[PDB]
């Protein structure tokens, strides 16, 4: 049959400053050090572009959230000027990129996807 998530690629939401921003709420915790979408408001460019709550950010506005901090994620968004691109993944999508040794960057959703048995793909890990 047809599989709803056989195209396992991160969704890209593009929104621009409307009211006091892009229309999404980022939550920060002393347990979850990374940033995640807490809430989206109906009348927002974020909601319109297909962003939801409880979505997690892997890249924002072309910047990679590879262990990035609160200041880093804000820097990525603010550097976009008046508009931003949000990459979010659900647990199903998140695990796939991890197991394939790759960050779910925008290049994967638009272009090529990695492969299993990722011993053939020479990941550049050296030193301990």
């Amino acid at each position: 049959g047809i599989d709803p998530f056989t195209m396992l690629r991160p969704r890209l939401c593009t929104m621009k400053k409307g009211p006091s921003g892009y229309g999404f709420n980022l939550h920060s915790d002393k347990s979850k050090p990374g940033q995640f979408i807490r809430s989206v408001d109906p009348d927002s460019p974020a909601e319109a572009s297909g962003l939801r709550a409880q979505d997690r950010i892997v890249e924002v506005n072309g910047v990679c959230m590879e262990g990035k901090q609160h200041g880093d994620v804000v820097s990525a968004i603010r550097a976009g000027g008046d508009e931003t691109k949000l990459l979010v993944v659900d647990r199903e999508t998140d695990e796939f990129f991890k197991k394939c040794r790759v960050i779910p960057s925008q290049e994967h959703l638009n272009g090529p996807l990695p492969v299993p048995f990722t011993n053939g793909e020479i990941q550049k890990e050296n030193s301990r």
């Binding site: 006091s20 892009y22 999404f24 709420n25 939550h27 920060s28 968004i77």
Partner: peptide
């Protein structure tokens, strides 16, 4: 606290 955008 949070951060809204």
């Amino acid at each position: 606290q949070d951060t809204r955008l």
